[PDB]
């Protein structure tokens, strides 16, 4: 059970957003089964709720949509998957 600071809330919202977009893309290849597709549905809704909430204890200049957070997740995953801070820049 790894200790984390605060804002790991924001980081985890960002991470999971990127996770959602991977499901979105995987489903397009028609390889996500029907139960997995419900998990995608559930996950999208649980996230927007968590996003709206977090979008309140956040300064109005730092309110990011589901879509902008997806872009942040994706660059995170690009780092994790290659174990590389180079990826997520613009060209890997």
């Amino acid at each position: 059970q790894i200790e984390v600071g605060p804002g790991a809330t924001n980081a985890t919202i960002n991470f999971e957003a990127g996770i959602l977009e991977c499901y979105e893309r995987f489903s397009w290849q028609r390889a996500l089964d029907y139960p997995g597709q419900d998990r995608l549905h559930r996950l999208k809704r649980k996230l927007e709720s968590r996003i709206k909430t977090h979008n309140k204890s956040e300064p109005e200049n730092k309110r990011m949509s589901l879509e902008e957070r997806k872009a942040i997740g994706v660059k995170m995953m690009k780092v994790l998957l290659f174990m590389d801070p180079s990826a997520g820049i613009e060209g890997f």
């Binding site: 979105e24 893309r25 995987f26 397009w28 290849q29 028609r30 390889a31 879509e67």
Partner: protein, 150 residues
């Protein structure tokens, strides 16, 4: 004439009938006939090289031994485009790339109060046919479609 192995993410594969003179576009259409993934969503690769739509399959080194990789690039999100009538007045419409040219023609028929039979649309010269999908013509967010009258 011979068959070509198309592999998809996940692992599944299937077979399309091709010729050494068939283009990537013609092949993409074949895939769209065979399993209903719009050509415009198809990104094809072979030996890690992405296949551009103009070249001939034999000129790209494909043969009955080959296996080609398919990735589907869809999108949930809609987009906004302009439709510039003949008088130079654009109007803003919200479209999905999976929608038909026909459904867009209806949004324009509603908004500009013109029978659908009385006009047709074009994108960068390429005319647009009712039954085909809007993605087939490469529409991008905030791009401009021209409306032609009769």
């Amino acid at each position: 004439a011979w068959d070509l192995k198309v592999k998809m993410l996940g692992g599944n594969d299937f077979l399309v009938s091709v010729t050494n003179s068939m283009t990537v576009s013609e092949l993409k259409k074949q895939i769209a006939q065979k399993i209903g993934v719009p050509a415009f969503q198809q990104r094809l690769a072979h030996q890690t090289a992405v296949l551009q739509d103009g070249l001939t399959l034999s000129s790209l080194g494909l043969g009955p031994s080959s296996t080609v990789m398919l990735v589907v690039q869809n999108c949930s999100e809609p987009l906004s485009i302009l439709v510039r009538n003949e008088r130079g007045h654009s109007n803003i419409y919200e479209v999905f790339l999976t929608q038909t040219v026909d459904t867009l023609k209806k949004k324009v028929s509603q908004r500009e109060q013109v029978h659908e039979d009385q006009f047709w649309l074009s994108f960068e010269g390429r005319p647009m046919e009712d039954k085909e999908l809007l993605g087939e013509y490469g529409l991008k967010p905030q791009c401009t479609v021209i409306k032609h009258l009769r």
